[PDB]
């Protein structure tokens, strides 16, 4: 607080760590689904959340969320992950990008399509 104290040892800034470290400050990373499975959300939610254990090009082995209804992902599927935590699944800090490199778009979806990789339906 004293000016002398600050001169001797200045205000040390709080270092902030990333909550998406496996992206290594990249908007997305390509990875391979080492396995595709379902898990249970923590309290108070209830579902099978669909997740993929994915090995990225940068070596990280992370768990990613597979959003939307239904997916075609299997093992050895090459997907993009974009980051963004799924709150009620602990330890799931990345989302799979729907419509990227192996992951299909969500079938028969009509609104918020760009969020799920769905082409504009034609009439």
């Amino acid at each position: 607080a004293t000016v002398n104290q600050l001169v001797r040892k200045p205000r040390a800034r709080k270092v902030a760590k990333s909550n998406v470290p496996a992206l290594e400050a990249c908007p997305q990373k390509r990875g391979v689904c080492t396995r595709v499975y379902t898990t249970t959300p923590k309290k108070p939610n209830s579902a099978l959340r669909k997740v993929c254990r994915v090995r990225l090009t940068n070596g990280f082995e992370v768990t990613s969320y597979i959003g939307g209804e239904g997916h075609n992902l299997q093992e050895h599927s090459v997907i993009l992950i974009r980051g963004g935590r799924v709150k009620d699944l602990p330890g799931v800090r990345y989302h799979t990008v729907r419509g990227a490199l192996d992951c299909s778009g969500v079938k028969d979806r009509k609104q918020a399509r760009s969020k799920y990789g769905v082409k504009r339906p034609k009439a």
């Binding site: 379902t38 209830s46 579902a47 099978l48």
Partner: protein, 203 residues
Amino acid sequence: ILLQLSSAQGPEECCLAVRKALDRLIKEATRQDVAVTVLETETGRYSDTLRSALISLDGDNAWALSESWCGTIQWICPSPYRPHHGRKNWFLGIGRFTADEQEQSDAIRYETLRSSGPGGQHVNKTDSAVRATHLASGISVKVQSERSQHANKRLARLLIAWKLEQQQQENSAALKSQRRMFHHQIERGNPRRTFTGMAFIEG
């Protein structure tokens, strides 16, 4: 063939569901000419509820039945044990295991040699230890805990018997471990089949 009806980690309603799905599978096997026999049967808090069940089937039609039932069984019923619980999707697991083993034949083969840790002239020279080997097993013992060949050979017979008995025991114990681990790998989601109501009314 050797299905395992389990309520995974689900509550007394999942146990009741295991008891009702077991009955439903009984009825389907009977109408489809398959016989069902309970082998291991663990119950929940209530006697009519089934914590788990082990089932033996029979025939080629048994495979079709096991394929129609293996997976997650979902029961849509409001709890009869908790009045206004809210959860109504008790999930089961049905999974075949095939805990089968063959009784490898008594084809022991004996080779009698000197003993290790001799202690004496007549011992240094006599051949009294008996090394027994079970053919088509891989079990080789060496008994030398007696003064004479013949006692060692008899102990070697008993010890081959006992080592096959263990081989049986670790085999059955690994099946035990697999069967409980089934109780933790039951995804309480995508149901192979869904039954509703208090009377399992559909399939």
